[PDB]
RNA sequence: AUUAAACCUUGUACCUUUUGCAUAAUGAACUAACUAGAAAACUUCUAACUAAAAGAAUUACAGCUAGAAACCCCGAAACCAAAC
């Protein structure tokens, strides 16, 4: 009765309306609704951090790495962490879509 | 396990020699160095 | 060694430079491996310098075939029929770039 | 018995080298052999010459009557280069004669014919084409390409070049590549 | 209800605690159920890989015994050939060995190769479920499962891990650098982390042992 | 010399077999077991060199003492003669 | 070198050993395999910990623990015991 879900891609692209989704999650926080020093709000609270990060990851689709977890002391890097894109395209894939000249031939034998 | 190739290295330069010198590694090596 | 080695006289392929200079090299073939220490320098070369060479010299056909391979190798074919193969086993990016430029000349 | 797999593999390469020397493989055209792209080679061929060619016309010039028969024979189990061939040969005769006359107006017409015939000889055309890799780019049903078929393509390409680049560029091409062959050639030799 | 764990020992004031995502194997999507704290002096040690290199050599070469032998001229009815059974056993300092294990833990965590789990219990013993879950969670080809004690390890996990060549299950006392390096990713239970920390953190002070602890 | 005209049979090695995969497990018995059992106690081999190492003369001497009562007369005499030659070289030269 | 295999031009076999010299003297018909440097007491270097160090026996007013680092081959005349 246990069926494995399909593997999900590791590529995450920042939403165009990142602030709108971001402030929506900040509103999800208990009464914050973009308060004073919103970017400087401390995340040291375990329960608040879990709720905020968990909700953001599900909606935005990007999750804080365990190794990078402790750097997420305040919001400022949370917004920065989500706004930096992540691409699953391989180097060969990027090279393929790089206006290859007519005399250059690439074949993937793997 | 590559001693044959070592002999071949001397032989390639000694193929044009005449007599037992061209086929004896003891003599072929000496001639090759002298030629160089 | 000269007595045991051949020699020739000065000559040109077909008087290449009388009207216009023609590049002898016509085709380049490259074999690479996804995971191989020997190909690390070649791996980076494809990332950075392969495109620049192709733009600089668009008249040479370049074949790049990443494949499971023990030793990466480069094969160069010339118009007159000369074909030369160079092993790229454990060679740096700078070494590779210089070699290709020498082959073209 | 000497142990190891590397040593045994090394001897196999030694055997192959001896086998290659003893029994050289039969010649085959690069077209049949792998890692051949006709379109890429033609583009590289045109770029290398620094000349503009109409890809459709150039392919027709390379196409030969013999090549079509093989495809038709395979089909049983496409445009010839004759039209282009005539233009290049006919134009070359006038252009080649023009070169001789300008330098040597005193030289008789009969002499120019001998010079033109030698410069347009099958061996002379074949030598230039083979050294130019044209044989690999030639389309034919037989390898090595027969000389008369090879000669047809050479002038056929000239006809295509005339349309693509005009007579002026072709004349420079003829001077740069064909008139060069007369260097060191004495009058009675030709 | 998030599962929140704190270090039992006093964390240094100048060092902030290390944290990681607590996971469960009950379901495919039960990747995150709580957040746990890790002692910086254990999971945030300096990356001294030479100690790990030395430990690997010690591990392989302390058990090494060579049985090669050859007879000398006096023993013939090799001038410098092997002579009888030879041993290469040697002992590294206790403090260094403990440090090497600590360094390995940091490498896996910093490299996102360590997965902290509340318990190893599985809904089914089918090996297919375990492998598929590893694929879902992007685990490595080889996954190492560690439990506090061998006797109490769940029956369901034993059947799956026993039948999997690349997924190996070991007890906490059996943990070693070689297995961690050999296995792409490490799965550690919450009690095991506490068990490991105590011994590693206990190493503080010397009070040199006047006699073996056996 | 002349070399094989055929390749040796292919060998396939499993790097994740139980022996290789589980090699070294419990090597931390001392630290993870409260030091009740020293890792030297995990050495398997000849009795006279379990938890001990030395040069060949020391190894041979220790072997003689450990199983001298169980050693064959021919073996014991041969070992004594070999030790005599070894003793002079190490202790006089 | 050469158009050209030989001609013209240049050049006193090898190892060892004698003086750092052989026109001395030793050894070599050739082919294939086999055929000769081996130890850690202390030091330097690489690290662990530090008035302490070492998983018992050791050393210490910066020491202590671990690791790495080394010293050939063949050949007598003889001498003795026990059999034949």
UniProtKB/Swiss-Prot annotation, chain A:
Belongs to the mitochondrion-specific ribosomal protein mL50 family. GO terms for biological process: mitochondrial translation. The keyword Ribonucleoprotein applies. The gene is Mrpl50. Component of the mitochondrial ribosome large subunit (39S) which comprises a 16S rRNA and about 50 distinct proteins. It comes from Mus musculus. The keyword Phosphoprotein does not apply. It is found in: Mitochondrion. This is Large ribosomal subunit protein mL50. Keywords: Mitochondrion, Ribonucleoprotein, Ribosomal protein. GO terms for cellular component: cytosol; mitochondrial inner membrane; mitochondrial large ribosomal subunit; mitochondrion.
From Swiss-Prot, chain B:
Signal peptide: none annotated. It is found in: Mitochondrion. Belongs to the bacterial ribosomal protein bL20 family. Component of the mitochondrial ribosome large subunit (39S) which comprises a 16S rRNA and about 50 distinct proteins. Interacts with OXA1L. This is Large ribosomal subunit protein bL20m. The chain holds residues 15 to 50 of 149 of the full protein.
UniProtKB/Swiss-Prot annotation, chain E:
The keyword Iron does not apply. Its main location: mitochondrion. One of its GO terms (cellular component) is mitochondrial large ribosomal subunit. Keywords: Methylation, Mitochondrion, Ribonucleoprotein, Ribosomal protein. It is found in: Mitochondrion. GO terms for biological process: mitochondrial translation. GO terms for molecular function: structural constituent of ribosome. Component of the mitochondrial ribosome large subunit (39S) which comprises a 16S rRNA and about 50 distinct proteins. Interacts with MIEF1 upstream open reading frame protein. Belongs to the universal ribosomal protein uL4 family. This is Large ribosomal subunit protein uL4m. The lineage of its organism: Eukaryota, Metazoa, Chordata, Craniata, Vertebrata. The chain holds residues 45 to 287 of 294 of the full protein.
Curated annotation (Swiss-Prot), chain F:
It is found in: Mitochondrion. Keywords: Mitochondrion, Ribonucleoprotein, Ribosomal protein, Transit peptide. Its main location: mitochondrion. GO terms for molecular function: structural constituent of ribosome. One of its GO terms (cellular component) is mitochondrion. One of its GO terms (biological process) is translation. Component of the mitochondrial ribosome large subunit (39S) which comprises a 16S rRNA and about 50 distinct proteins. Interacts with OXA1L. Belongs to the mitochondrion-specific ribosomal protein mL51 family. This is Large ribosomal subunit protein mL51. The gene is Mrpl51.
């Amino acid at each position: 009765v246990l069926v494995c879900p399909p593997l999900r891609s590791r590529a995450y692209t920042p939403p165009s309306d990142l602030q709108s989704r971001l402030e929506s999650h900040i509103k999800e926080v208990l009464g914050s609704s973009l308060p004073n020093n919103w970017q400087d709000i401390s995340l040291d609270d375990g329960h608040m951090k879990f709720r905020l990060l968990a909700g953001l990851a599900d909606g935005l689709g990007h999750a804080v790495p365990n190794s990078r977890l402790h750097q997420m002391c305040r919001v400022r890097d949370v917004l920065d962490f989500y706004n930096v894109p992540v691409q699953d395209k391989s180097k060969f894939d990027e090279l393929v879509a790089s206006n290859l000249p007519p005399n250059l031939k690439i074949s993937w034998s793997y | 396990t590559d001693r044959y190739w070592r002999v071949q290295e001397v032989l390639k330069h000694a193929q044009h020699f005449r007599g037992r010198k061209n086929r004896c590694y003891r003599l072929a090596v000496r001639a090759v160095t002298r030629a160089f | 060694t000269g007595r045991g080695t051949s020699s020739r006289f000065l000559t040109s392929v077909l008087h290449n430079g009388l009207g216009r200079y023609v590049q002898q090299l016509q085709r380049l073939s490259l074999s690479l491996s996804r995971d191989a220490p020997s190909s690390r320098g070649a791996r980076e070369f494809v990332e950075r310098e392969v495109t620049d060479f192709a733009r600089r010299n668009p008249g040479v056909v370049v074949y790049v075939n990443p494949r499971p391979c023990a030793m990466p190798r480069i094969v160069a074919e010339y118009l007159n029929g000369a074909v030369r193969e160079e092993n790229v086993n454990s060679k740096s990016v700078e070494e590779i770039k210089s070699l290709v430029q020498k082959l073209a000349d | 018995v000497k142990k190891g797999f590397r040593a045994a593999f090394r001897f196999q390469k030694e055997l192959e080298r001896w086998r290659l020397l003893r029994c050289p493989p039969p010649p085959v055209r690069r077209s049949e052999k792998p890692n051949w792209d006709y379109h890429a080679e033609v583009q590289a061929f045109g770029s290398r010459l620094q000349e503009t060619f109409s890809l459709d016309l150039l392919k027709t010039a390379f196409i030969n009557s013999c090549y079509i028969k093989s495809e038709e024979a395979k089909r049983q189990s496409l445009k010839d280069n004759q039209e282009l061939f005539e233009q290049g040969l006919s134009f070359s005769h006038r252009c080649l004669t023009q070169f001789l006359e300008d330098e040597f107006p005193d030289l008789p017409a009969e002499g120019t014919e001998s010079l033109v015939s030698f410069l347009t000889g099958e061996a002379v055309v074949c030598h230039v084409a083979r050294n130019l890799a044209v044989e690999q780019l030639t389309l034919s049903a037989e390898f090595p390409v027969p000389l008369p078929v090879l000669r047809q393509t050479f002038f056929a390409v000239i006809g295509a070049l005339l349309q693509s680049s005009g007579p002026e560029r072709a004349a420079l091409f003829i001077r740069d590549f064909l008139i060069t062959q007369m260097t060191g050639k004495e009058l009675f030799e030709m | 209800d998030p599962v929140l764990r704190k270090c039992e020992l006093r964390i240094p004031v100048h060092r902030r605690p290390v944290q990681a995502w607590v996971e469960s194997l009950r379901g495919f999507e039960q990747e995150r159920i709580g957040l746990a704290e890790l002692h910086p002096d254990v999971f945030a040690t300096a990356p001294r890989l030479d100690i790990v290199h030395q430990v690997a050599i010690w591990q392989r070469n302390f058990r090494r015994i060579s049985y090669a032998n050859t007879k000398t001229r006096a023993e013939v009815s090799v001038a410098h050939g092997p002579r009888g059974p030879t041993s290469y056993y040697y002992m590294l300092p206790m403090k260094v060995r403990a440090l090497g294990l600590k360094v390995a833990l940091t490498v896996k965590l910093m490299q996102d190769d360590l997965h902290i789990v509340d318990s190893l219990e599985l809904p089914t013993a089918d090996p297919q479920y375990l492998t598929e879950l590893a694929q879902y969670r992007h685990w490595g080809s080889s996954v190492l499962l560690v439990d506090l004690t061998h006797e109490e390890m769940p029956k369901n996990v034993v059947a799956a891990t026993s039948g999997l060549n690349s997924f190996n299950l070991i007890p906490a006392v059996g943990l070693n650098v070689y297995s961690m390096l050999k296995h792409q990713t490490l799965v550690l239970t919450l009690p095991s982390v506490a068990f490991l920390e105590d011994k590693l953190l206990w190493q503080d002070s010397r009070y040199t042992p006047l006699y073996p602890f056996r | 010399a002349f070399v094989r005209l055929t390749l040796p049979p292919p060998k396939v090695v499993d790097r994740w077999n139980e022996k290789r995969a589980l090699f070294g497990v419990y090597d931390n018995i001392g630290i993870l077991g409260n030091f009740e059992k020293h890792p030297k106690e995990l050495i398997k081999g000849p009795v006279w060199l379990r938890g001990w190492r030395g040069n060949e003369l020391q190894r041979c001497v220790r072997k003689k003492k450990f199983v001298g009562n169980r050693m064959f007369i021919e073996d014991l005499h041969n070992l004594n003669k070999r030790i005599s030659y070894l003793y002079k070289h190490f202790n006089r030269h």
